[PDB]
Amino acid sequence: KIEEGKLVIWINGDKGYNGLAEVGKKFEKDTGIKVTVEHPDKLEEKFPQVAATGDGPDIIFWAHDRFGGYAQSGLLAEITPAAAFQDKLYPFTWDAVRYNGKLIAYPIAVEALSLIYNKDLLPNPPKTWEEIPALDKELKAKGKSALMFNLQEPYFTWPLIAADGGYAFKYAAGKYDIKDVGVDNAGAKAGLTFLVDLIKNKHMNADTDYSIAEAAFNKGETAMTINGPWAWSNIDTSAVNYGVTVLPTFKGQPSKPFVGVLSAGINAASPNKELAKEFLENYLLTDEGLEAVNKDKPLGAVALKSYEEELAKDPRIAATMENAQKGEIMPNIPQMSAFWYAVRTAVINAASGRQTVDAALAAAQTNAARRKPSWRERENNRRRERRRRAVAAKIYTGLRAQGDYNLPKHCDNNEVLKALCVEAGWVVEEDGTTYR
Amino acid sequence: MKIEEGKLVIWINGDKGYNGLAEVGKKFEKDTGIKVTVEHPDKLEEKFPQVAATGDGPDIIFWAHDRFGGYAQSGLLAEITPAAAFQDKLYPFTWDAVRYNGKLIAYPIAVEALSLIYNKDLLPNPPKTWEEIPALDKELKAKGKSALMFNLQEPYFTWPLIAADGGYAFKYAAGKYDIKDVGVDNAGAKAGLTFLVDLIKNKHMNADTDYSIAEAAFNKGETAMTINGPWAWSNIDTSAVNYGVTVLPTFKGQPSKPFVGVLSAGINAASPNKELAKEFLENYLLTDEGLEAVNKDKPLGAVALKSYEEELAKDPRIAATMENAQKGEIMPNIPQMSAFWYAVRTAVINAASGRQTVDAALAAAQTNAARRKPSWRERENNRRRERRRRAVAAKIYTGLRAQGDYNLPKHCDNNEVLKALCVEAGWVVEEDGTTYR
DNA sequence: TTCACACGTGTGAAA
DNA sequence: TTCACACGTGTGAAA
Numbered sequence A: 001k002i003e004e005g006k007l008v009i010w011i012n013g014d015k016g017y018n019g020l021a022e023v024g025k026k027f028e029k030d031t032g033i034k035v036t037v038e039h040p041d042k043l044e045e046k047f048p049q050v051a052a053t054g055d056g057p058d059i060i061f062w063a064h065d066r067f068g069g070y071a072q073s074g075l076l077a078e079i080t081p082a083a084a085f086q087d088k089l090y091p092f093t094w095d096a097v098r099y100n101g102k103l104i105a106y107p108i109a110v111e112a113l114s115l116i117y118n119k120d121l122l123p124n125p126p127k128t129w130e131e132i133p134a135l136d137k138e139l140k141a142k143g144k145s146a147l148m149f150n151l152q153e154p155y156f157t158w159p160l161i162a163a164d165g166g167y168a169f170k171y172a173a174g175k176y177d178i179k180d181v182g183v184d185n186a187g188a189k190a191g192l193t194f195l196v197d198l199i200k201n202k203h204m205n206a207d208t209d210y211s212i213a214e215a216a217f218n219k220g221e222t223a224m225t226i227n228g229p230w231a232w233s234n235i236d237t238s239a240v241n242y243g244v245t246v247l248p249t250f251k252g253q254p255s256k257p258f259v260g261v262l263s264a265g266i267n268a269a270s271p272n273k274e275l276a277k278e279f280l281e282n283y284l285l286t287d288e289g290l291e292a293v294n295k296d297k298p299l300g301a302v303a304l305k306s307y308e309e310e311l312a313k314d315p316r317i318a319a320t321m322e323n324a325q326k327g328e329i330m331p332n333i334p335q336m337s338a339f340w341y342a343v344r345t346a347v348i349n350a351a352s353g354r355q356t357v358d359a360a361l362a363a364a365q366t367n368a369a370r371r372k373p374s375w376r377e378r379e380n381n382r383r384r385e386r387r388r389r390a391v392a393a394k395i396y397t398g399l400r401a402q403g404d405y406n407l408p409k410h411c412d413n414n415e416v417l418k419a420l421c422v423e424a425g426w427v428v429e430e431d432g433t434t435y436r
Numbered sequence B: 001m002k003i004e005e006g007k008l009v010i011w012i013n014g015d016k017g018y019n020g021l022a023e024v025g026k027k028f029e030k031d032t033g034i035k036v037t038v039e040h041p042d043k044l045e046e047k048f049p050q051v052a053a054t055g056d057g058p059d060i061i062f063w064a065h066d067r068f069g070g071y072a073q074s075g076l077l078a079e080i081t082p083a084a085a086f087q088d089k090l091y092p093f094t095w096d097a098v099r100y101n102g103k104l105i106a107y108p109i110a111v112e113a114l115s116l117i118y119n120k121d122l123l124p125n126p127p128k129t130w131e132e133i134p135a136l137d138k139e140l141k142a143k144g145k146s147a148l149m150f151n152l153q154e155p156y157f158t159w160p161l162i163a164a165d166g167g168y169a170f171k172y173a174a175g176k177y178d179i180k181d182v183g184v185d186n187a188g189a190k191a192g193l194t195f196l197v198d199l200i201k202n203k204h205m206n207a208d209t210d211y212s213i214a215e216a217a218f219n220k221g222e223t224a225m226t227i228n229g230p231w232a233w234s235n236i237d238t239s240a241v242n243y244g245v246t247v248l249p250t251f252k253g254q255p256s257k258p259f260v261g262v263l264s265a266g267i268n269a270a271s272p273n274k275e276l277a278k279e280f281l282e283n284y285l286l287t288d289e290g291l292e293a294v295n296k297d298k299p300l301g302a303v304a305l306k307s308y309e310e311e312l313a314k315d316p317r318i319a320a321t322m323e324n325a326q327k328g329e330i331m332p333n334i335p336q337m338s339a340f341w342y343a344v345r346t347a348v349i350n351a352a353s354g355r356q357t358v359d360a361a362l363a364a365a366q367t368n369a370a371r372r373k374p375s376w377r378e379r380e381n382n383r384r385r386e387r388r389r390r391a392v393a394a395k396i397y398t399g400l401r402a403q404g405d406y407n408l409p410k411h412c413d414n415n416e417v418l419k420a421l422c423v424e425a426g427w428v429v430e431e432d433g434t435t436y437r
Numbered sequence C, D: 001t002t003c004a005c006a007c008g009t010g011t012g013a014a015a
């Protein structure tokens, strides 16, 4: 739990938390405030469960798509940087972190998936998804594979699902229609069927996850992977000469990745809200601060204009933003969580053969729509059934006490009910068949 | 995933040397042409029993021996059939660790015991007792450091202190463990966990500290001590910290008693590669060169293979490891061990957080660790009984609604039908169900 | 050991 | 939207 004078940060384990820990240390030396960085598992899920009761970190790092629900549940302290600060960042990165007219976190970096390839195994990477199967057949004869990427998180498969028409929630009339979903249309089916066919034809394995794909590419066992800017440092430490380029087209259309804006929201329950902005505004979001983090694990197109003009000249960043322009920024609405869980279930269930593509995406469409019942709705149901059981229990208590039925020493209420039935002129068979 | 004929898939925990093991796999593929894939998924010791029940899961699974008895009872492991010649190459007691109902159910790899790891430059003379840690931490804090940080989310790391003054898991008597004789709630266990919660109350430790927080703190020089196993040394070596490995401190003048694990490799019962897995484990991994490749990635501890252990035993860090092991006990491998671990993990976490008193947390742990897990058939019995109870009721009300003519509204629940029936039989029923003649 | 009612949420109505 | 019986397991009685 939070406490005054200290700063605890939650950031995903694939970002440069060590580099950010070097930001907190210099922050500690200036004003004497200790700064701990922790990279817990499923931090995007734990934070909403714990922040309600007042627990959780001072600052939470995650992509912007989750912050709308967080704010909707009143977990985030509203951000109000001076004008002088707001102008230090690109406008569209402020838009990613504004929900109902209010800024709900500090945008940090823009992330988009790209195609990463091994130049030594594949000097000329494919321009199309359609030619990957043949390429894998050629590489399988050399003991390699064409492509491996995380199939457990729909983030990585969404570029292909959206290529031919799939979409999450249609945007029209300046709003996201929380009830117009595009996970079941012809384009989505085409994209997921091709992915499943890749598995069926043994060009990919349904159980490949982030760790398995990263190891295979960094050990030179697979020619390509799909990943974000954070993955680059680990490829750098390996012996692989890699390139970063546009994702392959599918049916002649670009892959359309969902673009995220890594952000840092301040816990509404924190006693260090001011201390946290002094850290975020004048220590992290500075050339030397982003540098220390970026040097750990690349951030992507950092939102600070001041440092992005430097990073923007990296050909890997140019490629990252080439993919981003062909994709879309993620909505931040609270229903993204339901959308992501549903599509995750669809991809996994179709990849494994547990469901057909048609059945998986059909269910996904209705799941990404589902309303989650409120606490009060759950409590209404709990109480109604408590009252139903209490009413029955009182009836049978009086029947047992006053009925003087010929009942066994121990018997259930069904037997009492039977004795009440015969008294009222009914016949009740062994199995409950009841008539006059 | 299913395991395919002609390929080998291995599961091993992420803190072990899976990169070294993958190199052994790459040699095996070079000599016989069989591809070997090594993965380190999360919660593998829980995932395996779920998938392997239907023939899924890996060909080979690595874990400490304590979980394998439950696997074998569930029929998930092949029986290990090493010729006597090969058995003689490993220490007898390591075979004991993987013997269950008289059969060998895994290949023992290495013996693991927790030790005290300390920063020589911050603390040239490590403490001999737990009792002096609070004072030592008070010194270190004045310099911006802490005395001790270790994993408080896995009971494995706190058990040495719980066991020190008398806590125990299952009592051994007459050549077997008594699954109803649990010792997580006696005076010694209470004293050990109380001292740990007292560390937390006096701000000498954080209740939320997990494995990665403690490892980062020690390896960065923020804390003078940690508690960990041999797997952790390689990350320390790469750090600036100059460390030593020594005996765990005493508690109430008595040695800490870590539970000792034997890293073991089981063969999935559903694998058609049982012969290939046996070949790989016997003739590639459990060799000098095989264990060396893994050990160089992350230290294994005291390996079961006599020939290579005579080399590793020269290491003072292994001598210390086995000094702690002698003071501890080999874990049981009985199926009830997972229930014991879940119970103590909840007790430690709840007490460390103040959610429960020590007495309450451990009282619940004792009941949970001793609770008999109902069989599948007992569960099915209960499920069918309640299915039948509802069915009889349903038929009774179906008949009452059909032939009753109780003048009831379009839709109404069974309680209202019951009420009508009661008045038909000469009863009065109030709104809340109060019923009488 | 078996057993019965409690328990809160699921599924599907009915509006 | 509210509502009701289904659902399998929990708590604890009787033996």
Ligand SMILES: OC[C@H]1O[C@H](O[C@H]2[C@H](O)[C@@H](O)[C@@H](O)O[C@@H]2CO)[C@H](O)[C@@H](O)[C@@H]1O
Pocket: A012, A014, A063, A064, A065, A066, A111, A153, A154, A155, A156, A228, A260, A340
């Ligand atoms: O897979 C669904 C997942 O997608 C995104 O998560 C990304 C994250 O944005 C990246 O920074 C990186 O960590 O990879 C993640 C995918 O594993 C969404 O941000 C997230 O809400 C969603 O659950």
Ligand SMILES: OC[C@H]1O[C@H](O[C@H]2[C@H](O)[C@@H](O)[C@@H](O)O[C@@H]2CO)[C@H](O)[C@@H](O)[C@@H]1O
Pocket: B013, B015, B045, B064, B065, B066, B067, B112, B154, B155, B156, B157, B229, B261, B341
């Ligand atoms: O914490 C309970 C846990 O303890 C042991 O797990 C150890 C394992 O033996 C070591 O090899 C290492 O990985 O640390 C683990 C604890 O995080 C038991 O083996 C395990 O069954 C039990 O759940």
